[PDB]
Amino acid sequence: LNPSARIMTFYPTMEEFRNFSRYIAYIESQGAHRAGLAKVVPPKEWKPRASYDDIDDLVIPAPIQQLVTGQSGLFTQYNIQKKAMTVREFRKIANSDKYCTPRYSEFEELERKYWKNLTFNPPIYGADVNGTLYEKHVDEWNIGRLRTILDLVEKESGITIEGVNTPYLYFGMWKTSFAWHTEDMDLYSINYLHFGEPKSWYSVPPEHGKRLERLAKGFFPGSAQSCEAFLRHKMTLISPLMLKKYGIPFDKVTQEAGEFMITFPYGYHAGFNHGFNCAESTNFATRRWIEYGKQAVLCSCRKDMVKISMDVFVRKFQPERYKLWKAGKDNTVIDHTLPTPEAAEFL
Amino acid sequence: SETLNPSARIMTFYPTMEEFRNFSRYIAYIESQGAHRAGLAKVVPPKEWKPRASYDDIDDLVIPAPIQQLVTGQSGLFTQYNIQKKAMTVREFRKIANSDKYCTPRYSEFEELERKYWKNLTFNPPIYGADVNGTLYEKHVDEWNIGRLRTILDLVEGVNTPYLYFGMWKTSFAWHTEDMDLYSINYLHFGEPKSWYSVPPEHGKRLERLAKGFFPGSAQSCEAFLRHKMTLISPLMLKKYGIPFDKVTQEAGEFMITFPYGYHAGFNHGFNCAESTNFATRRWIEYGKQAVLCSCRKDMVKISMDVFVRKFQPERYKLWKAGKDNTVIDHTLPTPEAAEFL
Amino acid sequence: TLNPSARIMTFYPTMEEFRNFSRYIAYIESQGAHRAGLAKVVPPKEWKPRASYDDIDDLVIPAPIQQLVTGQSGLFTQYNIQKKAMTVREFRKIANSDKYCTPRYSEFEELERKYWKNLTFNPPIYGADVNGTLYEKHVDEWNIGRLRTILDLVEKESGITIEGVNTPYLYFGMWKTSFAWHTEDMDLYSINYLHFGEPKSWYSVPPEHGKRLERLAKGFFPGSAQSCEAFLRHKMTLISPLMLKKYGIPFDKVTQEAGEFMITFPYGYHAGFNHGFNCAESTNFATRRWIEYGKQAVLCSCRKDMVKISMDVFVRKFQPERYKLWKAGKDNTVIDHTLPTPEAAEFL
Amino acid sequence: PSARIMTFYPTMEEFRNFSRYIAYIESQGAHRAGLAKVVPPKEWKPRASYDDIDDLVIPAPIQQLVTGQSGLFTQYNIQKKAMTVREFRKIANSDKYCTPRYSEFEELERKYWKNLTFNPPIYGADVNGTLYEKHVDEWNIGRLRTILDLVEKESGITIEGVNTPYLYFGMWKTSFAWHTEDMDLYSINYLHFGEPKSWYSVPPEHGKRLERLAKGFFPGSAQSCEAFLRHKMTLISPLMLKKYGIPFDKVTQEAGEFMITFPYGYHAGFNHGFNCAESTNFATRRWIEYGKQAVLCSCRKDMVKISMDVFVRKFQPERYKLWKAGKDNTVIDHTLPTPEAAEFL
Amino acid sequence: XVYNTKSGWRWYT
Amino acid sequence: XVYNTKSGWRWYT
Amino acid sequence: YNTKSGWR
Amino acid sequence: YNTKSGWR
Ligand SMILES: O=C(O)CNC(=O)C(=O)O
Ligand SMILES: O=C(O)CNC(=O)C(=O)O
Ligand SMILES: O=C(O)CNC(=O)C(=O)O
Ligand SMILES: O=C(O)CNC(=O)C(=O)O
Ligand SMILES: [Cl-]
Ligand SMILES: [Cl-]
Ligand SMILES: [Cl-]
Ligand SMILES: [Cl-]
Ligand SMILES: [Cl-]
Ligand code: NI
Ligand code: NI
Ligand code: NI
Ligand code: NI
Ligand SMILES: [Zn+2]
Ligand SMILES: [Zn+2]
Ligand SMILES: [Zn+2]
Ligand SMILES: [Zn+2]
């Protein structure tokens, strides 16, 4: 509902494209971060892989069938594990008459069908598959080696976590989706669409994110009492109509093949896949994320929930505040509009 | 045998204690009255009999693998997925099942409660304490002890063992016959009622046809996908396509007998506990030979019929081994043992 | 004056003499064969009851019996323990294995000694009392299925059949399986035909000395005789031939080869064992001479379901003269075990 | 020590707590022989009289036919007509079945192994029932209150003879074959009245040897079933154990005396004359491992199996997942006593 | 129990 | 994965 | 019948 | 299972 929280898309030059962290700083100087979601179109000359011809034999070890229950625009999604399969088998199912994309004339019709048939004919989503489709030598925006301060966790403490500091492959089909969530530890996210049908995203500006979770708490009270950050479980789906009804601002955007998508700290997002496709994703950070990580509210009802130590980041970047924070008396309040400090060159 | 129970309706029996004492003889008797033609029958034991003095010492019982029943579908066609949950005691289950979130909605008549079930079974998925190895019968009970029925099924010695089912509102069981088209016995120890739907075995094929029409992918995947017990079909669909069926509500203290090749389904009204097992009679042997089994995985229930063919049909053993034993089952005919009643 | 020594006789009927079973029984009895209580008949070489025996491997034996024996010094008791049904091919597999195969020996006396020595050890299984026939339908000569004997009246009148008496029984034998001292039910006639396999050895006590055996048996099993009037009809009592020698019971022994018939005559006590894997078919039958035997037969009194044939129809149809006397418990007629069957008049 | 069978004479105060006293005798090494005798206080009586049990029914008496030679025998239990205790007593004390004349135990044992295949006697085994009076709270076989109860408390399943009491009416020459308890459980046996019951025990430490020996002497049986001794049909004479070096001990149980078998303790025996014993299985924490490792009969579906899930998770949480995964590799040292015995050491 | 066949008493359990 | 339980396929993660 | 005292 | 796509 806010003009200044609106999703921006960018068309960098090759020269601009070669330095990732700098260009992230640049889009923050343009206000992109304020929408919680930015789209980056890479130059025509850039290809992360010569061909996708050699992936049909690839294995999806733990495919999931997404059963959805709910009504009146509120839903809960249960991920049921399925037998491992290859991308060939998965492709057979994805283009089948039962699971193929429905016929439509405009995007709005496909959105209507998505929210209309969400709970019917549950699709299989090949989510969370370890791997990268980048060629190892490619230095331009290689999700496998993004080289940003997040590496402190692996370089400073040698801790390996799937998806956050390692690349993740997502093989989608029609009606597969991701619930309303922010990254673990409220980090940044990078998502590249290698090939296939589009993926559509809903975004809520971080400035209003608290409102959203407040609303969520009200509509899933029994879930909220068990865990305050129950949205971290990525099981809650909320419809655009319901956001408008309760005055939550949001934007939407459609991501096509060969395009990049960036989520910014504390930017709630959800979405769904138009058809058979493949994406590669990881998390990343800037200096501005540090405060976000210090104040991140996490799930406390799971053993394996992602909890990262912020000690080293503070010591390396906020020494003047370190001992006070480790003391626990640090009450700095975040301003979501502020671009990252690495935009000094800009601004 | 076609004269008995021509309508193929569900029959309810009221044996005396004298009649009750011999389980297999009473099964043969109810078949001599044509009960089996319905695929489902109800036995009401005499008020004097009790499997257990009280059900107030069962709180420590454990449900190792409770399942949450997520149901997806519309227009009377649904697919149920049972998700394994954390173990819990009967006491915990009783607390949850009585909670305002899962408790039995308010209704006056049964038709209203059924309506709510078919309207809301997709929402607020419930928890079912099913497939629990155990028993609530006291050790000394020798009448109709689901634990040790001692039918010819024991010649294979899973199937002849007792199981417990802790139900809450709108937990349900999908359309199915028994593994190997066996018999089943169900006793409701306590709690809210359990409603059933049944198709006369004579008309079972029609159900299968209709089911294959509604889930073609499942039918291509598997010959007997109903054996997965994930398929739910409302009575309004059955009646919409001319399929004969009947309904019965089982109360606490009542027995339900399902007969070979009798498709049944249903749902629980609220917190209750039932005990059940599979069993056989001589009449089941042919059904066991002609049963169409699940093909798509290794751990589907399969019983070797060789032992039963040797003991009860020696003269046909050779014929049966050569694949030349094509004999037609007459569903109306009662079990051989029923001769003394016919 | 015919076969005064009551020794087991063998007959070699021509195919012509083979046509009428009852007639040839009359003949062998006209020769004194019945005095031994057991006879052997060798059918003509050209005769065959069954063209081939290779299509029976899947025949089901419903109640195999594991034959457990206890005893010492030539006295033994046999308990038959039921086992689960098995096919003929499984039975033959077990019979020919090392565990149960026939031991290698030189002469018959060696196998007889080893049988009596090892009788209690390594109990064999006996495929006994199997309902069925291996006769082909078209065989009109000596068909155990349809012998056309006066005994067939029992079914015709009462309408009740007695498995193994009015109907055929099959026996699949292995080494050391044995049948205990006994006479046929109601003291009837017996017919046994060895279809294939190893031989079957028999011991036979002539009817004229049956009582002596009985006496001896009661002395050696006093408790059993207290419990029942005819405990030998339980078919559990085994008595070695050396015990019979020691106590003066006359007997003879005979070995039946494949393709051969053995006839047991009324009140002729017999026993024996099988050398190895074999198959025999058997049933009961009767002649006029049997009627008197069946009237005075002493039956098992400790069981309600023992074989009992009503004699009233036989007496009414063949003994009009004494239905009144016998039916009034006054027919004191004695039985001469020597005398042949009436039907032997045409030969005597 | 010497792994010999031990006998204990508790005070009434010691006797009151069953599990505690079991733990104590194990703290004394009683469990190494595989068999221990407990003599109860003289004052203690389980039943006021044994005159009102004459019309008790033995549903399935078995006639024990034995075949074999040279100390190796196989036993076959043939079912007979049901009879009352009175009829059984009359048969057992009759001349045909009564105990031969003997002067010392060694002679009677000699006569048993000599006449084992002759005059098969009738054994009134496996009779559901108890002879304890209703309010006897000490050493009551019906309600021993050990951790074994957990299974029934969680599922309600009961195995007759394991979780419930069995009565055995014996006569001369009736015998129980070499065996360990189902799931390698503990056993408690009490002789109510009548003539004595003789026992042979092999120490658990040497259990495997016995199995090897049995397997060698009954090769076919061992091919069919992994644990063929669990059919309880194999009899082996003491002479044959000595010849092949199996260490064993013997002991005779008298009326009013308790016998306790310990996990993986192979034992066999025979009755001297007409008598009546009551027994059942029980467990301790030490048993849990034994149950996890027990080699069970593999040829029959009707055989006794107990799920250890409840035991492992409640008493061995640390290994549960590992165990459930199948990765637990504990080696049982049969020398060690029960945990609950800590208070004595 | 016991069942009396033509071959004698047969013992079945 | 899945298990074939009595009440049908059981889904366990 | 599977019994404790053995195979009956 | 705990995986990033969410509770499994
Ligand atoms: O691809 C998906 O299903 C979900 N992706 C994301 O939430 C992301 O890339 O940040
Ligand atoms: O009780 C249930 O949930 C299912 N019952 C049956 O399918 C039955 O008893 O045959
Ligand atoms: O074949 C057997 O085992 C026994 N035969 C007979 O006793 C007979 O034929 O009369
Ligand atoms: O008493 C018997 O006959 C047998 N007893 C046992 O094997 C025992 O108590 O462990
Ligand atoms: Cl909620
Ligand atoms: Cl209750
Ligand atoms: Cl489908
Ligand atoms: Cl005697
Ligand atoms: Cl062997
Ligand atoms: Ni995300
Ligand atoms: Ni059912
Ligand atoms: Ni005979
Ligand atoms: Ni024992
Ligand atoms: Zn949580
Ligand atoms: Zn299937
Ligand atoms: Zn008798
Ligand atoms: Zn076994």
mmCIF file of N, CA, C and O in Angstrom, chain B residues 272-333:
data_model
loop_
_atom_site.group_PDB
_atom_site.id
_atom_site.type_symbol
_atom_site.label_atom_id
_atom_site.label_comp_id
_atom_site.label_asym_id
_atom_site.label_seq_id
_atom_site.Cartn_x
_atom_site.Cartn_y
_atom_site.Cartn_z
ATOM 1 N N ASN B 272 -13.319 -42.377 21.979
ATOM 2 C CA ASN B 272 -13.743 -43.752 22.219
ATOM 3 C C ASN B 272 -12.538 -44.670 22.082
ATOM 4 O O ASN B 272 -11.444 -44.247 21.700
ATOM 5 N N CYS B 273 -12.759 -45.947 22.385
ATOM 6 C CA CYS B 273 -11.738 -46.968 22.203
ATOM 7 C C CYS B 273 -12.385 -48.245 21.695
ATOM 8 O O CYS B 273 -13.355 -48.729 22.282
ATOM 9 N N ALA B 274 -11.833 -48.794 20.617
ATOM 10 C CA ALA B 274 -12.311 -50.038 20.038
ATOM 11 C C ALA B 274 -11.161 -51.031 19.968
ATOM 12 O O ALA B 274 -9.992 -50.654 19.968
ATOM 13 N N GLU B 275 -11.508 -52.310 19.914
ATOM 14 C CA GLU B 275 -10.533 -53.381 19.800
ATOM 15 C C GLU B 275 -10.941 -54.255 18.630
ATOM 16 O O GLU B 275 -12.132 -54.444 18.387
ATOM 17 N N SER B 276 -9.971 -54.787 17.892
ATOM 18 C CA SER B 276 -10.355 -55.474 16.668
ATOM 19 C C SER B 276 -9.281 -56.456 16.233
ATOM 20 O O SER B 276 -8.128 -56.391 16.671
ATOM 21 N N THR B 277 -9.691 -57.365 15.347
ATOM 22 C CA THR B 277 -8.760 -58.315 14.750
ATOM 23 C C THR B 277 -9.374 -58.848 13.462
ATOM 24 O O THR B 277 -10.549 -58.611 13.161
ATOM 25 N N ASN B 278 -8.554 -59.564 12.701
ATOM 26 C CA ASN B 278 -8.997 -60.318 11.538
ATOM 27 C C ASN B 278 -9.258 -61.754 11.960
ATOM 28 O O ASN B 278 -8.660 -62.255 12.914
ATOM 29 N N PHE B 279 -10.164 -62.419 11.248
ATOM 30 C CA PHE B 279 -10.347 -63.845 11.473
ATOM 31 C C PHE B 279 -10.879 -64.482 10.202
ATOM 32 O O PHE B 279 -11.154 -63.807 9.207
ATOM 33 N N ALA B 280 -10.992 -65.807 10.235
ATOM 34 C CA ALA B 280 -11.420 -66.562 9.071
ATOM 35 C C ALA B 280 -12.383 -67.662 9.484
ATOM 36 O O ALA B 280 -12.485 -68.032 10.656
ATOM 37 N N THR B 281 -13.103 -68.163 8.487
ATOM 38 C CA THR B 281 -13.851 -69.409 8.551
ATOM 39 C C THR B 281 -13.512 -70.194 7.291
ATOM 40 O O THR B 281 -12.745 -69.730 6.441
ATOM 41 N N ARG B 282 -14.083 -71.390 7.147
ATOM 42 C CA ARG B 282 -13.816 -72.167 5.940
ATOM 43 C C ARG B 282 -14.238 -71.402 4.687
ATOM 44 O O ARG B 282 -13.527 -71.416 3.672
ATOM 45 N N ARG B 283 -15.372 -70.698 4.751
ATOM 46 C CA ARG B 283 -15.855 -69.952 3.591
ATOM 47 C C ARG B 283 -14.851 -68.910 3.110
ATOM 48 O O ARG B 283 -14.861 -68.543 1.930
ATOM 49 N N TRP B 284 -13.988 -68.408 3.994
ATOM 50 C CA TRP B 284 -13.032 -67.400 3.553
ATOM 51 C C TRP B 284 -11.980 -67.974 2.616
ATOM 52 O O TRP B 284 -11.399 -67.218 1.831
ATOM 53 N N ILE B 285 -11.729 -69.284 2.662
ATOM 54 C CA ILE B 285 -10.573 -69.827 1.949
ATOM 55 C C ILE B 285 -10.619 -69.427 0.476
ATOM 56 O O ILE B 285 -9.635 -68.916 -0.075
ATOM 57 N N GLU B 286 -11.770 -69.617 -0.178
ATOM 58 C CA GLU B 286 -11.863 -69.260 -1.589
ATOM 59 C C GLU B 286 -11.585 -67.773 -1.797
ATOM 60 O O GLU B 286 -10.828 -67.398 -2.702
ATOM 61 N N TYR B 287 -12.162 -66.912 -0.953
ATOM 62 C CA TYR B 287 -11.848 -65.488 -1.033
ATOM 63 C C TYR B 287 -10.347 -65.256 -0.927
ATOM 64 O O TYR B 287 -9.784 -64.434 -1.660
ATOM 65 N N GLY B 288 -9.682 -65.964 -0.011
ATOM 66 C CA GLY B 288 -8.246 -65.793 0.122
ATOM 67 C C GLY B 288 -7.513 -66.166 -1.148
ATOM 68 O O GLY B 288 -6.514 -65.538 -1.510
ATOM 69 N N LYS B 289 -8.011 -67.180 -1.854
ATOM 70 C CA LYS B 289 -7.346 -67.613 -3.077
ATOM 71 C C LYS B 289 -7.524 -66.591 -4.194
ATOM 72 O O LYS B 289 -6.605 -66.370 -4.992
ATOM 73 N N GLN B 290 -8.686 -65.942 -4.256
ATOM 74 C CA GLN B 290 -9.027 -65.051 -5.358
ATOM 75 C C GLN B 290 -8.775 -63.579 -5.041
ATOM 76 O O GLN B 290 -9.189 -62.710 -5.815
ATOM 77 N N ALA B 291 -8.097 -63.277 -3.934
ATOM 78 C CA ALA B 291 -7.902 -61.893 -3.526
ATOM 79 C C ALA B 291 -6.923 -61.168 -4.449
ATOM 80 O O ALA B 291 -5.880 -61.709 -4.827
ATOM 81 N N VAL B 292 -7.266 -59.929 -4.799
ATOM 82 C CA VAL B 292 -6.424 -59.065 -5.622
ATOM 83 C C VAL B 292 -5.642 -58.153 -4.686
ATOM 84 O O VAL B 292 -6.233 -57.330 -3.978
ATOM 85 N N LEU B 293 -4.319 -58.280 -4.689
ATOM 86 C CA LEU B 293 -3.477 -57.642 -3.687
ATOM 87 C C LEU B 293 -2.746 -56.425 -4.242
ATOM 88 O O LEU B 293 -2.627 -56.227 -5.454
ATOM 89 N N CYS B 294 -2.250 -55.604 -3.317
ATOM 90 C CA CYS B 294 -1.447 -54.440 -3.673
ATOM 91 C C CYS B 294 -0.125 -54.878 -4.288
ATOM 92 O O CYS B 294 0.543 -55.787 -3.785
ATOM 93 N N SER B 295 0.263 -54.216 -5.379
ATOM 94 C CA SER B 295 1.449 -54.609 -6.129
ATOM 95 C C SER B 295 2.670 -53.728 -5.880
ATOM 96 O O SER B 295 3.797 -54.213 -6.030
ATOM 97 N N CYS B 296 2.491 -52.470 -5.479
ATOM 98 C CA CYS B 296 3.553 -51.477 -5.634
ATOM 99 C C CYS B 296 4.578 -51.433 -4.498
ATOM 100 O O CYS B 296 5.471 -50.580 -4.555
ATOM 101 N N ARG B 297 4.519 -52.290 -3.485
ATOM 102 C CA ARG B 297 5.581 -52.276 -2.488
ATOM 103 C C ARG B 297 5.733 -53.637 -1.822
ATOM 104 O O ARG B 297 4.925 -54.548 -2.017
ATOM 105 N N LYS B 298 6.797 -53.748 -1.020
ATOM 106 C CA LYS B 298 7.245 -55.029 -0.481
ATOM 107 C C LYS B 298 6.481 -55.450 0.767
ATOM 108 O O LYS B 298 6.298 -56.651 0.994
ATOM 109 N N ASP B 299 6.037 -54.501 1.590
ATOM 110 C CA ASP B 299 5.479 -54.827 2.896
ATOM 111 C C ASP B 299 3.951 -54.835 2.907
ATOM 112 O O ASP B 299 3.346 -54.656 3.968
ATOM 113 N N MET B 300 3.321 -55.048 1.753
ATOM 114 C CA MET B 300 1.880 -55.275 1.711
ATOM 115 C C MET B 300 1.534 -56.645 2.289
ATOM 116 O O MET B 300 2.266 -57.617 2.096
ATOM 117 N N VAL B 301 0.403 -56.718 2.992
ATOM 118 C CA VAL B 301 0.015 -57.954 3.666
ATOM 119 C C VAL B 301 -0.283 -59.021 2.621
ATOM 120 O O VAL B 301 -1.134 -58.834 1.743
ATOM 121 N N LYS B 302 0.410 -60.152 2.721
ATOM 122 C CA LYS B 302 0.185 -61.285 1.835
ATOM 123 C C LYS B 302 0.265 -62.566 2.649
ATOM 124 O O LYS B 302 1.248 -62.792 3.359
ATOM 125 N N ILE B 303 -0.759 -63.405 2.542
ATOM 126 C CA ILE B 303 -0.803 -64.674 3.255
ATOM 127 C C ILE B 303 -0.785 -65.801 2.238
ATOM 128 O O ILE B 303 -1.523 -65.767 1.248
ATOM 129 N N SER B 304 0.060 -66.795 2.487
ATOM 130 C CA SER B 304 0.128 -67.970 1.628
ATOM 131 C C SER B 304 -1.079 -68.868 1.873
ATOM 132 O O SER B 304 -1.343 -69.275 3.009
ATOM 133 N N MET B 305 -1.811 -69.179 0.804
ATOM 134 C CA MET B 305 -2.999 -70.018 0.893
ATOM 135 C C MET B 305 -2.692 -71.505 0.748
ATOM 136 O O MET B 305 -3.606 -72.327 0.875
ATOM 137 N N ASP B 306 -1.431 -71.866 0.503
ATOM 138 C CA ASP B 306 -1.080 -73.262 0.256
ATOM 139 C C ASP B 306 -1.493 -74.160 1.419
ATOM 140 O O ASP B 306 -2.005 -75.269 1.210
ATOM 141 N N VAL B 307 -1.294 -73.689 2.652
ATOM 142 C CA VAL B 307 -1.601 -74.495 3.829
ATOM 143 C C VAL B 307 -3.102 -74.781 3.912
ATOM 144 O O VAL B 307 -3.524 -75.917 4.190
ATOM 145 N N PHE B 308 -3.929 -73.769 3.638
ATOM 146 C CA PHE B 308 -5.376 -73.946 3.706
ATOM 147 C C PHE B 308 -5.881 -74.836 2.583
ATOM 148 O O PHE B 308 -6.826 -75.612 2.774
ATOM 149 N N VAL B 309 -5.276 -74.733 1.402
ATOM 150 C CA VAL B 309 -5.703 -75.581 0.298
ATOM 151 C C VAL B 309 -5.360 -77.030 0.593
ATOM 152 O O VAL B 309 -6.151 -77.939 0.311
ATOM 153 N N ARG B 310 -4.184 -77.277 1.174
ATOM 154 C CA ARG B 310 -3.840 -78.644 1.545
ATOM 155 C C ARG B 310 -4.820 -79.194 2.571
ATOM 156 O O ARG B 310 -5.364 -80.291 2.397
ATOM 157 N N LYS B 311 -5.068 -78.444 3.649
ATOM 158 C CA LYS B 311 -5.887 -79.005 4.719
ATOM 159 C C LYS B 311 -7.340 -79.188 4.290
ATOM 160 O O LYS B 311 -7.944 -80.227 4.586
ATOM 161 N N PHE B 312 -7.925 -78.206 3.595
ATOM 162 C CA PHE B 312 -9.367 -78.211 3.359
ATOM 163 C C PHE B 312 -9.788 -78.520 1.927
ATOM 164 O O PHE B 312 -10.976 -78.776 1.700
ATOM 165 N N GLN B 313 -8.874 -78.493 0.960
ATOM 166 C CA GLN B 313 -9.226 -78.827 -0.418
ATOM 167 C C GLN B 313 -8.140 -79.692 -1.044
ATOM 168 O O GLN B 313 -7.627 -79.361 -2.121
ATOM 169 N N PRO B 314 -7.770 -80.806 -0.413
ATOM 170 C CA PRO B 314 -6.720 -81.653 -1.001
ATOM 171 C C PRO B 314 -6.994 -82.013 -2.445
ATOM 172 O O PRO B 314 -6.095 -81.937 -3.293
ATOM 173 N N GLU B 315 -8.243 -82.370 -2.756
ATOM 174 C CA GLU B 315 -8.595 -82.814 -4.099
ATOM 175 C C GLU B 315 -8.357 -81.732 -5.144
ATOM 176 O O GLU B 315 -8.159 -82.058 -6.318
ATOM 177 N N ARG B 316 -8.364 -80.468 -4.745
ATOM 178 C CA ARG B 316 -8.118 -79.383 -5.689
ATOM 179 C C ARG B 316 -6.694 -78.841 -5.644
ATOM 180 O O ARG B 316 -6.378 -77.914 -6.368
ATOM 181 N N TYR B 317 -5.829 -79.418 -4.821
ATOM 182 C CA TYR B 317 -4.489 -78.854 -4.672
ATOM 183 C C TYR B 317 -3.760 -78.789 -6.010
ATOM 184 O O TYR B 317 -3.336 -77.714 -6.451
ATOM 185 N N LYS B 318 -3.609 -79.939 -6.672
ATOM 186 C CA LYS B 318 -2.989 -79.970 -7.992
ATOM 187 C C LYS B 318 -3.598 -78.904 -8.898
ATOM 188 O O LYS B 318 -2.896 -78.025 -9.414
ATOM 189 N N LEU B 319 -4.921 -78.959 -9.078
ATOM 190 C CA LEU B 319 -5.605 -77.996 -9.934
ATOM 191 C C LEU B 319 -5.211 -76.570 -9.579
ATOM 192 O O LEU B 319 -4.969 -75.743 -10.465
ATOM 193 N N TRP B 320 -5.121 -76.270 -8.280
ATOM 194 C CA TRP B 320 -4.829 -74.911 -7.838
ATOM 195 C C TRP B 320 -3.389 -74.513 -8.140
ATOM 196 O O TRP B 320 -3.119 -73.338 -8.415
ATOM 197 N N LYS B 321 -2.455 -75.466 -8.104
ATOM 198 C CA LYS B 321 -1.056 -75.140 -8.369
ATOM 199 C C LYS B 321 -0.835 -74.822 -9.843
ATOM 200 O O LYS B 321 -0.033 -73.943 -10.183
ATOM 201 N N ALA B 322 -1.544 -75.519 -10.732
ATOM 202 C CA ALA B 322 -1.402 -75.337 -12.170
ATOM 203 C C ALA B 322 -2.040 -74.051 -12.681
ATOM 204 O O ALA B 322 -1.967 -73.790 -13.886
ATOM 205 N N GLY B 323 -2.656 -73.248 -11.817
ATOM 206 C CA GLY B 323 -3.372 -72.075 -12.275
ATOM 207 C C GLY B 323 -4.678 -72.365 -12.976
ATOM 208 O O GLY B 323 -5.239 -71.464 -13.609
ATOM 209 N N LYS B 324 -5.185 -73.593 -12.882
ATOM 210 C CA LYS B 324 -6.401 -74.002 -13.570
ATOM 211 C C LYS B 324 -7.617 -74.042 -12.654
ATOM 212 O O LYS B 324 -8.648 -74.601 -13.041
ATOM 213 N N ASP B 325 -7.526 -73.466 -11.455
ATOM 214 C CA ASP B 325 -8.611 -73.539 -10.475
ATOM 215 C C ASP B 325 -9.447 -72.260 -10.527
ATOM 216 O O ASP B 325 -9.443 -71.428 -9.621
ATOM 217 N N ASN B 326 -10.187 -72.127 -11.629
ATOM 218 C CA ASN B 326 -11.069 -70.980 -11.849
ATOM 219 C C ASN B 326 -12.462 -71.351 -11.354
ATOM 220 O O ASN B 326 -13.262 -71.946 -12.078
ATOM 221 N N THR B 327 -12.773 -70.991 -10.108
ATOM 222 C CA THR B 327 -14.098 -71.232 -9.547
ATOM 223 C C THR B 327 -14.729 -69.912 -9.131
ATOM 224 O O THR B 327 -14.050 -69.018 -8.618
ATOM 225 N N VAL B 328 -16.035 -69.805 -9.350
ATOM 226 C CA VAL B 328 -16.763 -68.564 -9.126
ATOM 227 C C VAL B 328 -17.314 -68.557 -7.708
ATOM 228 O O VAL B 328 -17.900 -69.545 -7.250
ATOM 229 N N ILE B 329 -17.131 -67.435 -7.019
ATOM 230 C CA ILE B 329 -17.626 -67.257 -5.661
ATOM 231 C C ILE B 329 -19.069 -66.776 -5.721
ATOM 232 O O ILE B 329 -19.385 -65.814 -6.433
ATOM 233 N N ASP B 330 -19.948 -67.441 -4.973
ATOM 234 C CA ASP B 330 -21.326 -66.996 -4.792
ATOM 235 C C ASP B 330 -21.415 -66.282 -3.449
ATOM 236 O O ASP B 330 -21.341 -66.917 -2.390
ATOM 237 N N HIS B 331 -21.587 -64.959 -3.498
ATOM 238 C CA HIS B 331 -21.506 -64.147 -2.289
ATOM 239 C C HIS B 331 -22.671 -64.396 -1.340
ATOM 240 O O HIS B 331 -22.520 -64.217 -0.128
ATOM 241 N N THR B 332 -23.840 -64.797 -1.857
ATOM 242 C CA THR B 332 -24.991 -65.025 -0.980
ATOM 243 C C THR B 332 -24.853 -66.308 -0.172
ATOM 244 O O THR B 332 -25.470 -66.424 0.889
ATOM 245 N N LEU B 333 -24.060 -67.264 -0.649
ATOM 246 C CA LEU B 333 -24.001 -68.570 -0.013
ATOM 247 C C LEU B 333 -23.358 -68.460 1.375
ATOM 248 O O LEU B 333 -22.337 -67.778 1.539
#
